[PDB]
Amino acid sequence: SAVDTIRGYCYQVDKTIIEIFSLPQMDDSIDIECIEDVDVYNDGHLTAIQCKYYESTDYNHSVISKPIRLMLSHFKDNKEKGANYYLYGHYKSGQEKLTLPLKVDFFKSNFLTYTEKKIKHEYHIENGLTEEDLQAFLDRLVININAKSFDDQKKETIQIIKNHFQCEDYEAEHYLYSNAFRKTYDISCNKKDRRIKKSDFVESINKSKVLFNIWFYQYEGRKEYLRKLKESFIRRSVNTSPYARFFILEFQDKTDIKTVKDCIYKIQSNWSNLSKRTDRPYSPFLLFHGTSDANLYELKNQLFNEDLIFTDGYPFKGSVFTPKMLIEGFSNKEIHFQFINDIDDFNETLNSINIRKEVYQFYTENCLDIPSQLPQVNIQVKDFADIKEIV
Amino acid sequence: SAVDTIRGYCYQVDKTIIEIFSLPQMDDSIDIECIEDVDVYNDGHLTAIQCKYYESTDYNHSVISKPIRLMLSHFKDNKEKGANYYLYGHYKSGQEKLTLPLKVDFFKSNFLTYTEKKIKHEYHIENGLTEEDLQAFLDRLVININAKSFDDQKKETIQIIKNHFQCEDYEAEHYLYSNAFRKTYDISCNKKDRRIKKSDFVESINKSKVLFNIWFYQYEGRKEYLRKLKESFIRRSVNTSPYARFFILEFQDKTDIKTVKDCIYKIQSNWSNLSKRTDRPYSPFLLFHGTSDANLYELKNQLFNEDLIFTDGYPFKGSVFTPKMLIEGFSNKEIHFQFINDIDDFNETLNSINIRKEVYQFYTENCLDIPSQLPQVNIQVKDFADIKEIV
Numbered sequence A, B: 001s002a003v004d005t006i007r008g009y010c011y012q013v014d015k016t017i018i019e020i021f022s023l024p025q026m027d028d029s030i031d032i033e034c035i036e037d038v039d040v041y042n043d044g045h046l047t048a049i050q051c052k053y054y055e056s057t058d059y060n061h062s063v064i065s066k067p068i069r070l071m072l073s074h075f076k077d078n079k080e081k082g083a084n085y086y087l088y089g090h091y092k093s094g095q096e097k098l099t100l101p102l103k104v105d106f107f108k109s110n111f112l113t114y115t116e117k118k119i120k121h122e123y124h125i126e127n128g129l130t131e132e133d134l135q136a137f138l139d140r141l142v143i144n145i146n147a148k149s150f151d152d153q154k155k156e157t158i159q160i161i162k163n164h165f166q167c168e169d170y171e172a173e174h175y176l177y178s179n180a181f182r183k184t185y186d187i188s189c190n191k192k193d194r195r196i197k198k199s200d201f202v203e204s205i206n207k208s209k210v211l212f213n214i215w216f217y218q219y220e221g222r223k224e225y226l227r228k229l230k231e232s233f234i235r236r237s238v239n240t241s242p243y244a245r246f247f248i249l250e251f252q253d254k255t256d257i258k259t260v261k262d263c264i265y266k267i268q269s270n271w272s273n274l275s276k277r278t279d280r281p282y283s284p285f286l287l288f289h290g291t292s293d294a295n296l297y298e299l300k301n302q303l304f305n306e307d308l309i310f311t312d313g314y315p316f317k318g319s320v321f322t323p324k325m326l327i328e329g330f331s332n333k334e335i336h337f338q339f340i341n342d343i344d345d346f347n348e349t350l351n352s353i354n355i356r357k358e359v360y361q362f363y364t365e366n367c368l369d370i371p372s373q374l375p376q377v378n379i380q381v382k383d384f385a386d387i388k389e390i391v
Helices: A002-009 A011-021 A065-077 A104-110 A132-139 A150-165 A176-188 A198-202 A215-220 A223-239 A257-270 A293-305 A324-331 A346-350 B002-024 B065-076 B106-111 B133-141 B150-163 B178-191 B198-202 B212-219 B221-236 B258-270 B293-303 B325-329 B343-350
Strands: A049-051 A085-089 A113-116 A117-124 A141-143 A244-250 A285-291 A356-365 A377-382 B050-051 B084-087 B141-144 B244-250 B287-288 B338-340 B357-363 B376-381
Touching: A002 A049, A002 A215, A011 A049, A011 A085, A011 A141, A011 A150, A011 A176, A011 A198, A049 A215, A065 A085, A065 A132, A104 A113, A132 A141, A150 A176, A215 A223, A223 A377, A223 B002, A244 A257, B002 B084, B002 B150, B002 B178, B002 B198, B002 B212, B065 B084, B065 B106, B065 B133, B065 B343, B106 B133, B133 B141, B150 B178, B178 B212, B212 B221, B221 B376, B244 B258, B258 B293, B287 B343, B325 B338, B338 B343
Parallel strands: A049 A085, A085 A141, A244 A285, A244 A356, A356 A377, B050 B084, B084 B141, B244 B287, B244 B357, B287 B338, B357 B376
Antiparallel strands: A113 A117
């Protein structure tokens, strides 16, 4: 369907970022196949790139007849752009049938000649295209039915992403591949004569912050893309270990409070064990930024009036920031979770703890810089409501 | 033995007080002999009023000879003061020896023709005086050796007050008599031609506040003056019932903090039965005023480090007053006492409490208006440290 548009629009990106890391010059010498101009808000149409994997069958000239025809209509109406059309494929057999290179008298004999509703068509005749006008299309056209499988190129992209600065495989396919994807895409669509340098690429896509891949969540689906984040980052990380776990969250004034609350309940429900029949309990910590004081205060009262007990180190008015109650609250069972008001009180909370410390930071437009020592996890999202389905 | 000055300065005030309530006019006309000017910081050497009680002894003249002579010395140079001199007595016999009206001849050779160190003295001829000046002194001299006893007059003065107010025994001796004393003294001392009015005097000395009587403080001593307040007002009735007691204390920004905590500790140690067996526990309430938030907040920061756990409604920064945590901590044994920050949050606590409420206030300079609905106990003191010896 139209997924082959997406399932393949990423192939040309991987082939492009593989084209950079394989380059060992480590200097500013490489150019890029540039212009897409997609505006991925909808992304269902505008199929300038595709990839087909009828490997269970063979290439037949009739599976890819229509895509090339829809490609021709784009060049037919927009010849004056100089962009390139890309087509890839991976089949069991049948690759021998595509007589390469592409010639016109072979082009219109198997691709532009088809049968629809017991009548035949000739696309070049039915649109008035000279063979000279057709020659530009076949030149701008890129066909490779002998290409690697989509899965094997994705893995080949991973093993190369590990073999640049020696990361781990079980965690890199959700961190480095993503930030390199969007970076290459934004560089491609921009026609600012921006050619990449291999040095600047790596030193600008590795900050422990997972950015939003606007293509993957369209490929897998929000219900599934969020599950891919849960099983990879947080479910792999910890299952039952009592540590000092932190949850930094960005929420702006536009965000609803009743939505934020139901997220806090999910953290306490999953990342806590205040059992009467246990001897090593744990309760989590929170933190917020990018809001007003009264909005944070009005949030606390509701959680307290709803009988969800917590502590923020201020047991009374005029109390200095006393963190030892957070340690007691971390072990107390009448305290469901802990609260951290501001940022200056956050650094002081780390210095007063002598056990394992993890950080799960989320943000929309502004992320908080965190000391490099702790196992921090920074994650970008579109809406706040997507966080509940990760924790 | 200079108490005869103090003990007898009261007798004039009591007699001055008796003559007011005896007057049934309830109107303007009553005038007081005014000039005292004692400056009672020391009050030792100055003797304008004296009263001797030599029961089991007889009125001689060697007993009151010098007290009369010391008055004449105070009259020789102060011949123009226009004040009166008082001397009252209460003996068993010998009053017949006096000669009223006191004439000049009996004045000379009974007290002035005295003997000292085997030397015969004549105070009048020695200091060069005449009967025109001596009679002028007798014209301003008050001698009644046939007077009431000190205690019998003190008992009698109390009964005059209990009749007018229909009050209780403790509500008269330590509340009404004391405030009527410093009222009369201050009025008598003042020379603004202030003719006292019966109605105005009665309705201006009853505000449920027990004032500071420096005479009783100097006649009985801090060792005893505080003990009377203890047995009369507080240890009188309230001993061990789980009520809601509200201690209110005034302290300016000039009082030692250690002076305050030792009082709070005594309060908490005397109004808490948070034992292991008691199924009906209770813990007291505290409220301060007349200070800065700097001192009051740091005071609380010393107690939580001293492991004296309390509550003041606010469980976190930017919270709103939650009085149920005070009620929850009132019966919770991990909470040692309850704190109240301001008077407004105090007012919102009474209507939230539905048990017996008692109020004990201590103050030095400024008091707090308290609704007459509650059994308020307001007490003026000289120094803040005198409260540990009361509660």
